[PDB]
Design a protein around this ligand. Structure first.
Ligand SMILES: CC[C@H](C)NC(=O)[C@H](CCC1CCCCC1)NC(=O)c1ccc(CNC(=O)c2cnn(-c3ccccc3)c2N)cc1
Length: 341
Protein backbone atom coordinates (compact mmCIF):
# COMPACT_ATOMS: atom_id res chain seq x y z
CA UNK A 1 0.00 0.00 0.00
CA UNK A 2 1.38 3.42 -0.95
CA UNK A 3 1.37 6.62 1.07
CA UNK A 4 -1.57 8.89 0.42
CA UNK A 5 -1.87 12.63 0.92
CA UNK A 6 -4.93 14.83 1.35
CA UNK A 7 -6.12 18.23 0.11
CA UNK A 8 -9.40 20.14 -0.55
CA UNK A 9 -10.36 21.23 -4.10
CA UNK A 10 -13.39 23.32 -5.29
CA UNK A 11 -15.53 22.14 -2.33
CA UNK A 12 -14.32 18.45 -2.37
CA UNK A 13 -11.93 16.15 -0.44
CA UNK A 14 -9.16 14.40 -2.49
CA UNK A 15 -6.96 11.69 -0.91
CA UNK A 16 -4.51 10.25 -3.42
CA UNK A 17 -1.13 8.43 -3.61
CA UNK A 18 2.04 10.60 -3.56
CA UNK A 19 2.68 9.11 -6.97
CA UNK A 20 0.12 11.70 -8.30
CA UNK A 21 1.21 15.36 -8.00
CA UNK A 22 -0.12 18.82 -8.97
CA UNK A 23 -3.80 18.13 -9.04
CA UNK A 24 -5.70 20.78 -10.95
CA UNK A 25 -9.45 20.65 -11.66
CA UNK A 26 -10.43 20.50 -15.33
CA UNK A 27 -13.63 21.24 -17.26
CA UNK A 28 -15.57 23.10 -14.53
CA UNK A 29 -17.69 20.01 -13.67
CA UNK A 30 -18.36 19.03 -17.33
CA UNK A 31 -16.42 15.81 -16.94
CA UNK A 32 -17.23 14.90 -13.40
CA UNK A 33 -15.07 15.76 -10.45
CA UNK A 34 -11.78 15.25 -12.36
CA UNK A 35 -8.23 16.55 -11.87
CA UNK A 36 -5.31 16.76 -14.22
CA UNK A 37 -2.25 15.51 -12.36
CA UNK A 38 1.36 14.58 -12.90
CA UNK A 39 2.23 10.92 -12.56
CA UNK A 40 5.73 10.62 -11.01
CA UNK A 41 5.95 6.94 -11.98
CA UNK A 42 5.93 7.73 -15.76
CA UNK A 43 6.51 11.50 -15.92
CA UNK A 44 3.16 11.75 -17.79
CA UNK A 45 0.16 13.95 -17.34
CA UNK A 46 -2.95 11.96 -16.29
CA UNK A 47 -6.55 12.54 -15.35
CA UNK A 48 -7.91 11.48 -11.97
CA UNK A 49 -11.71 11.12 -11.45
CA UNK A 50 -13.20 10.75 -7.97
CA UNK A 51 -16.60 9.19 -8.27
CA UNK A 52 -19.42 11.20 -6.76
CA UNK A 53 -21.32 9.27 -4.05
CA UNK A 54 -20.51 5.92 -5.55
CA UNK A 55 -22.57 3.76 -3.09
CA UNK A 56 -25.35 6.10 -2.11
CA UNK A 57 -28.06 3.84 -3.50
CA UNK A 58 -28.36 0.42 -5.15
CA UNK A 59 -28.38 2.19 -8.50
CA UNK A 60 -25.27 4.30 -7.85
CA UNK A 61 -23.57 1.20 -6.43
CA UNK A 62 -24.37 -0.78 -9.58
CA UNK A 63 -23.35 2.08 -11.92
CA UNK A 64 -20.06 2.31 -10.05
CA UNK A 65 -19.46 -1.41 -10.46
CA UNK A 66 -20.41 -1.21 -14.17
CA UNK A 67 -18.07 1.68 -14.85
CA UNK A 68 -15.21 -0.08 -13.15
CA UNK A 69 -15.84 -3.39 -14.95
CA UNK A 70 -16.00 -1.65 -18.36
CA UNK A 71 -12.93 0.44 -17.75
CA UNK A 72 -10.85 -2.63 -16.65
CA UNK A 73 -11.93 -4.39 -19.77
CA UNK A 74 -10.97 -1.79 -22.40
CA UNK A 75 -7.50 -2.43 -23.96
CA UNK A 76 -7.47 -0.76 -27.31
CA UNK A 77 -5.82 2.25 -28.77
CA UNK A 78 -9.05 4.02 -29.68
CA UNK A 79 -10.95 3.34 -26.41
CA UNK A 80 -10.31 5.01 -23.08
CA UNK A 81 -8.41 2.71 -20.71
CA UNK A 82 -7.63 2.37 -17.03
CA UNK A 83 -4.07 3.29 -15.89
CA UNK A 84 -4.97 2.92 -12.22
CA UNK A 85 -7.86 2.58 -9.75
CA UNK A 86 -7.41 3.31 -6.08
CA UNK A 87 -9.15 4.00 -2.79
CA UNK A 88 -7.56 5.23 0.41
CA UNK A 89 -9.59 2.64 2.47
CA UNK A 90 -7.61 -0.24 4.08
CA UNK A 91 -10.60 -2.61 4.28
CA UNK A 92 -14.06 -3.25 2.86
CA UNK A 93 -15.57 -1.79 6.09
CA UNK A 94 -13.84 1.55 5.42
CA UNK A 95 -14.50 1.50 1.60
CA UNK A 96 -16.31 4.65 0.48
CA UNK A 97 -14.34 6.43 -2.33
CA UNK A 98 -13.15 5.27 -5.78
CA UNK A 99 -10.70 7.14 -7.88
CA UNK A 100 -10.09 6.33 -11.52
CA UNK A 101 -6.90 7.24 -13.45
CA UNK A 102 -6.79 7.51 -17.21
CA UNK A 103 -4.69 9.32 -19.80
CA UNK A 104 -5.36 13.02 -19.99
CA UNK A 105 -6.79 13.69 -23.50
CA UNK A 106 -6.23 16.95 -25.44
CA UNK A 107 -9.69 18.21 -26.48
CA UNK A 108 -13.11 16.91 -27.49
CA UNK A 109 -14.56 16.86 -30.98
CA UNK A 110 -17.29 19.31 -30.04
CA UNK A 111 -14.40 21.79 -29.42
CA UNK A 112 -12.82 20.92 -32.81
CA UNK A 113 -15.78 21.09 -35.26
CA UNK A 114 -16.86 24.17 -33.16
CA UNK A 115 -13.34 25.54 -33.99
CA UNK A 116 -11.87 24.08 -37.24
CA UNK A 117 -13.37 23.52 -40.74
CA UNK A 118 -12.18 19.93 -41.05
CA UNK A 119 -10.35 18.54 -44.10
CA UNK A 120 -11.50 15.37 -45.87
CA UNK A 121 -8.26 13.63 -44.84
CA UNK A 122 -8.78 14.53 -41.22
CA UNK A 123 -12.38 13.23 -41.43
CA UNK A 124 -11.12 9.90 -42.91
CA UNK A 125 -8.70 9.44 -40.08
CA UNK A 126 -10.99 10.50 -37.21
CA UNK A 127 -13.96 8.35 -38.42
CA UNK A 128 -11.56 5.48 -39.11
CA UNK A 129 -10.41 5.48 -35.51
CA UNK A 130 -13.99 5.71 -34.14
CA UNK A 131 -14.96 2.72 -36.25
CA UNK A 132 -11.88 0.82 -35.23
CA UNK A 133 -12.64 1.34 -31.53
CA UNK A 134 -16.32 0.43 -32.19
CA UNK A 135 -15.33 -2.84 -33.91
CA UNK A 136 -13.57 -3.69 -30.66
CA UNK A 137 -16.44 -2.62 -28.27
CA UNK A 138 -19.03 -4.30 -30.43
CA UNK A 139 -17.05 -7.57 -30.55
CA UNK A 140 -17.42 -7.84 -26.76
CA UNK A 141 -21.24 -7.20 -27.09
CA UNK A 142 -20.87 -3.78 -25.56
CA UNK A 143 -22.98 -0.96 -27.05
CA UNK A 144 -21.88 2.58 -26.45
CA UNK A 145 -25.38 4.20 -26.92
CA UNK A 146 -24.24 7.71 -26.28
CA UNK A 147 -21.88 8.52 -29.12
CA UNK A 148 -21.58 12.24 -29.74
CA UNK A 149 -18.75 14.71 -30.34
CA UNK A 150 -18.20 15.50 -26.64
CA UNK A 151 -17.65 11.76 -25.92
CA UNK A 152 -14.67 11.62 -28.36
CA UNK A 153 -11.31 12.95 -27.35
CA UNK A 154 -8.33 13.60 -29.57
CA UNK A 155 -4.67 14.62 -29.06
CA UNK A 156 -2.49 17.00 -31.05
CA UNK A 157 -1.38 14.05 -33.22
CA UNK A 158 -5.14 13.48 -34.03
CA UNK A 159 -5.14 10.18 -32.22
CA UNK A 160 -8.72 9.59 -31.05
CA UNK A 161 -10.25 7.77 -28.10
CA UNK A 162 -13.91 6.82 -27.44
CA UNK A 163 -15.20 7.50 -23.99
CA UNK A 164 -18.36 8.28 -21.99
CA UNK A 165 -18.35 11.21 -19.64
CA UNK A 166 -21.99 10.49 -18.67
CA UNK A 167 -24.55 13.07 -17.53
CA UNK A 168 -24.62 22.50 -25.07
CA UNK A 169 -24.81 19.32 -27.26
CA UNK A 170 -27.81 16.94 -26.92
CA UNK A 171 -27.54 13.15 -27.12
CA UNK A 172 -30.82 13.06 -29.09
CA UNK A 173 -29.19 14.80 -32.06
CA UNK A 174 -26.95 11.66 -32.59
CA UNK A 175 -29.40 9.00 -31.48
CA UNK A 176 -30.68 6.23 -33.80
CA UNK A 177 -34.44 6.51 -34.60
CA UNK A 178 -35.14 2.95 -33.34
CA UNK A 179 -33.96 3.78 -29.78
CA UNK A 180 -35.66 7.17 -29.97
CA UNK A 181 -39.17 5.95 -30.27
CA UNK A 182 -39.73 2.24 -29.27
CA UNK A 183 -36.67 0.55 -27.60
CA UNK A 184 -37.15 -3.21 -28.40
CA UNK A 185 -35.60 -3.85 -31.88
CA UNK A 186 -32.00 -2.51 -31.83
CA UNK A 187 -28.48 -3.80 -32.11
CA UNK A 188 -24.92 -2.61 -32.00
CA UNK A 189 -25.68 -0.48 -35.14
CA UNK A 190 -27.35 2.23 -33.03
CA UNK A 191 -23.69 3.38 -32.64
CA UNK A 192 -23.18 3.42 -36.38
CA UNK A 193 -26.13 5.84 -36.80
CA UNK A 194 -24.36 8.09 -34.35
CA UNK A 195 -21.06 7.88 -36.31
CA UNK A 196 -23.00 8.88 -39.44
CA UNK A 197 -24.36 11.99 -37.65
CA UNK A 198 -20.85 12.80 -36.34
CA UNK A 199 -19.16 12.34 -39.75
CA UNK A 200 -21.77 14.55 -41.39
CA UNK A 201 -21.09 17.32 -38.89
CA UNK A 202 -17.30 17.05 -39.39
CA UNK A 203 -17.82 17.33 -43.14
CA UNK A 204 -20.29 20.27 -43.13
CA UNK A 205 -19.65 22.03 -39.77
CA UNK A 206 -23.40 21.73 -38.92
CA UNK A 207 -25.36 19.41 -36.65
CA UNK A 208 -27.16 17.14 -39.11
CA UNK A 209 -30.38 16.63 -37.11
CA UNK A 210 -30.66 19.34 -34.44
CA UNK A 211 -34.16 18.45 -33.23
CA UNK A 212 -35.78 20.14 -30.22
CA UNK A 213 -37.38 16.93 -28.83
CA UNK A 214 -38.07 13.34 -29.84
CA UNK A 215 -40.91 14.17 -32.21
CA UNK A 216 -39.05 17.00 -33.93
CA UNK A 217 -35.91 14.81 -34.01
CA UNK A 218 -37.72 12.06 -35.88
CA UNK A 219 -39.14 14.62 -38.37
CA UNK A 220 -35.71 15.98 -39.23
CA UNK A 221 -34.52 12.42 -39.69
CA UNK A 222 -37.36 11.36 -42.01
CA UNK A 223 -36.83 14.43 -44.18
CA UNK A 224 -33.36 13.12 -45.12
CA UNK A 225 -33.85 9.33 -45.13
CA UNK A 226 -37.53 9.26 -46.18
CA UNK A 227 -40.49 7.68 -44.40
CA UNK A 228 -40.34 3.89 -43.85
CA UNK A 229 -41.50 1.73 -46.77
CA UNK A 230 -43.78 -1.30 -46.31
CA UNK A 231 -40.73 -3.59 -45.86
CA UNK A 232 -39.61 -1.67 -42.76
CA UNK A 233 -43.24 -1.13 -41.49
CA UNK A 234 -43.54 -4.93 -41.35
CA UNK A 235 -40.89 -5.04 -38.61
CA UNK A 236 -42.42 -2.35 -36.33
CA UNK A 237 -44.19 -4.13 -33.43
CA UNK A 238 -45.16 -0.96 -31.54
CA UNK A 239 -48.72 -0.18 -32.65
CA UNK A 240 -48.43 3.49 -31.55
CA UNK A 241 -45.15 3.97 -33.38
CA UNK A 242 -46.60 2.36 -36.49
CA UNK A 243 -49.71 4.50 -36.29
CA UNK A 244 -47.60 7.61 -35.81
CA UNK A 245 -45.23 6.90 -38.74
CA UNK A 246 -48.03 5.95 -41.16
CA UNK A 247 -49.97 9.07 -40.01
CA UNK A 248 -47.26 11.39 -41.42
CA UNK A 249 -47.30 12.73 -44.94
CA UNK A 250 -44.98 10.44 -46.85
CA UNK A 251 -41.47 11.69 -47.70
CA UNK A 252 -38.93 10.50 -50.29
CA UNK A 253 -35.42 9.44 -49.46
CA UNK A 254 -33.17 12.31 -50.42
CA UNK A 255 -30.16 11.68 -52.68
CA UNK A 256 -27.26 12.34 -50.24
CA UNK A 257 -25.08 13.71 -53.10
CA UNK A 258 -27.64 16.56 -53.36
CA UNK A 259 -27.32 17.17 -49.59
CA UNK A 260 -23.57 16.78 -48.95
CA UNK A 261 -22.70 18.71 -52.10
CA UNK A 262 -19.00 18.81 -52.95
CA UNK A 263 -18.08 16.09 -50.41
CA UNK A 264 -15.81 13.18 -51.35
CA UNK A 265 -18.30 10.79 -53.06
CA UNK A 266 -16.80 7.94 -51.05
CA UNK A 267 -17.82 9.92 -47.91
CA UNK A 268 -21.36 10.37 -49.37
CA UNK A 269 -21.60 6.66 -50.13
CA UNK A 270 -20.49 5.63 -46.66
CA UNK A 271 -23.02 8.07 -45.14
CA UNK A 272 -25.78 6.39 -47.25
CA UNK A 273 -24.74 3.08 -45.66
CA UNK A 274 -24.65 4.39 -42.10
CA UNK A 275 -27.79 6.53 -42.11
CA UNK A 276 -30.37 3.87 -43.05
CA UNK A 277 -33.53 3.55 -41.10
CA UNK A 278 -33.73 -0.21 -40.96
CA UNK A 279 -31.15 -1.36 -38.44
CA UNK A 280 -30.91 -4.77 -40.11
CA UNK A 281 -29.46 -3.09 -43.25
CA UNK A 282 -27.11 -0.57 -41.62
CA UNK A 283 -23.42 -1.16 -42.11
CA UNK A 284 -21.49 -2.65 -39.19
CA UNK A 285 -18.25 -1.22 -37.81
CA UNK A 286 -16.28 -4.15 -39.21
CA UNK A 287 -17.84 -3.73 -42.67
CA UNK A 288 -17.35 0.04 -42.64
CA UNK A 289 -13.58 -0.28 -41.94
CA UNK A 290 -13.29 -2.11 -45.30
CA UNK A 291 -15.17 0.72 -47.12
CA UNK A 292 -13.10 2.34 -49.89
CA UNK A 293 -13.26 5.68 -48.02
CA UNK A 294 -10.70 4.32 -45.54
CA UNK A 295 -8.24 2.88 -48.16
CA UNK A 296 -5.35 4.99 -46.80
CA UNK A 297 -5.83 3.59 -43.25
CA UNK A 298 -7.57 0.16 -43.31
CA UNK A 299 -5.34 -2.68 -42.18
CA UNK A 300 -7.34 -5.83 -41.56
CA UNK A 301 -4.39 -7.22 -39.55
CA UNK A 302 -4.46 -4.27 -37.13
CA UNK A 303 -8.22 -3.93 -36.25
CA UNK A 304 -8.38 -6.24 -33.27
CA UNK A 305 -11.44 -7.67 -31.50
CA UNK A 306 -11.88 -7.79 -27.73
CA UNK A 307 -11.74 -10.56 -25.20
CA UNK A 308 -15.24 -11.59 -24.15
CA UNK A 309 -16.87 -9.52 -21.46
CA UNK A 310 -18.93 -11.09 -18.68
CA UNK A 311 -22.04 -8.97 -18.70
CA UNK A 312 -24.09 -11.43 -16.56
CA UNK A 313 -24.09 -9.00 -13.61
CA UNK A 314 -26.41 -6.65 -15.52
CA UNK A 315 -29.44 -8.88 -14.94
CA UNK A 316 -28.71 -9.18 -11.16
CA UNK A 317 -30.64 -7.41 -8.36
CA UNK A 318 -28.35 -6.99 -5.35
CA UNK A 319 -28.04 -4.87 -2.21
CA UNK A 320 -25.83 -1.79 -1.94
CA UNK A 321 -23.30 -3.59 0.22
CA UNK A 322 -23.12 -6.43 -2.27
CA UNK A 323 -22.40 -4.08 -5.22
CA UNK A 324 -19.93 -2.30 -2.95
CA UNK A 325 -18.06 -5.54 -2.18
CA UNK A 326 -17.94 -6.56 -5.78
CA UNK A 327 -16.43 -3.16 -6.65
CA UNK A 328 -13.91 -3.61 -3.80
CA UNK A 329 -12.91 -6.98 -5.36
CA UNK A 330 -12.36 -5.33 -8.73
CA UNK A 331 -10.24 -2.59 -7.15
CA UNK A 332 -8.05 -5.21 -5.39
CA UNK A 333 -7.64 -7.48 -8.39
CA UNK A 334 -6.58 -4.60 -10.73
CA UNK A 335 -3.32 -5.36 -12.62
CA UNK A 336 -1.84 -2.14 -13.98
CA UNK A 337 -0.97 -1.94 -17.67
CA UNK A 338 2.62 -2.17 -19.07
CA UNK A 339 4.28 1.32 -18.97
CA UNK A 340 6.92 1.12 -21.88
CA UNK A 341 6.46 4.04 -24.40
C1 LIG B 1 -21.84 7.11 -18.74
C2 LIG B 1 -21.44 6.08 -17.77
C3 LIG B 1 -20.11 6.38 -17.07
C4 LIG B 1 -20.02 7.78 -16.49
N1 LIG B 1 -19.09 6.15 -18.11
C5 LIG B 1 -18.47 4.98 -18.23
O1 LIG B 1 -18.88 3.95 -17.72
C6 LIG B 1 -17.14 5.00 -19.03
C7 LIG B 1 -16.44 3.66 -19.24
C8 LIG B 1 -17.21 2.75 -20.18
C9 LIG B 1 -16.80 2.67 -21.66
C10 LIG B 1 -16.32 3.99 -22.25
C11 LIG B 1 -15.93 3.93 -23.73
C12 LIG B 1 -16.53 2.73 -24.43
C13 LIG B 1 -17.94 2.47 -23.95
C14 LIG B 1 -17.97 2.11 -22.48
N2 LIG B 1 -16.24 5.93 -18.39
C15 LIG B 1 -15.43 6.72 -19.10
O2 LIG B 1 -15.44 6.73 -20.32
C16 LIG B 1 -14.48 7.59 -18.34
C17 LIG B 1 -14.01 7.29 -17.07
C18 LIG B 1 -13.05 8.08 -16.47
C19 LIG B 1 -12.54 9.19 -17.12
C20 LIG B 1 -11.44 10.00 -16.47
N3 LIG B 1 -10.74 10.88 -17.39
C21 LIG B 1 -11.16 12.12 -17.67
O3 LIG B 1 -12.12 12.65 -17.10
C22 LIG B 1 -10.45 12.82 -18.75
C23 LIG B 1 -9.52 12.37 -19.71
N4 LIG B 1 -9.21 13.29 -20.60
N5 LIG B 1 -9.95 14.38 -20.23
C24 LIG B 1 -9.93 15.54 -21.06
C25 LIG B 1 -9.33 16.71 -20.61
C26 LIG B 1 -9.36 17.84 -21.41
C27 LIG B 1 -9.98 17.81 -22.64
C28 LIG B 1 -10.58 16.65 -23.09
C29 LIG B 1 -10.56 15.50 -22.30
C30 LIG B 1 -10.70 14.14 -19.12
N6 LIG B 1 -11.51 15.05 -18.55
C31 LIG B 1 -13.03 9.50 -18.37
C32 LIG B 1 -13.99 8.72 -18.98
Amino acid sequence: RPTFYRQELNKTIWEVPERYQNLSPVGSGAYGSVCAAFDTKTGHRVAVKKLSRPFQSIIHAKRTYRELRLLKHMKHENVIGLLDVFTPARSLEEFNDVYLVTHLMGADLNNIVKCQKLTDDHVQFLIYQILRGLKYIHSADIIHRDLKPSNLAVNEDCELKILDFGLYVATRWYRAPEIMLNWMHYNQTVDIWSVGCIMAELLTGRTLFPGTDHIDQLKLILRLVGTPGAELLKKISSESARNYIQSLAQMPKMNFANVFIGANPLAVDLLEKMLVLDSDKRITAAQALAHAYFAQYHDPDDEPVADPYDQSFESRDLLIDEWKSLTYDEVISFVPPPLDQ
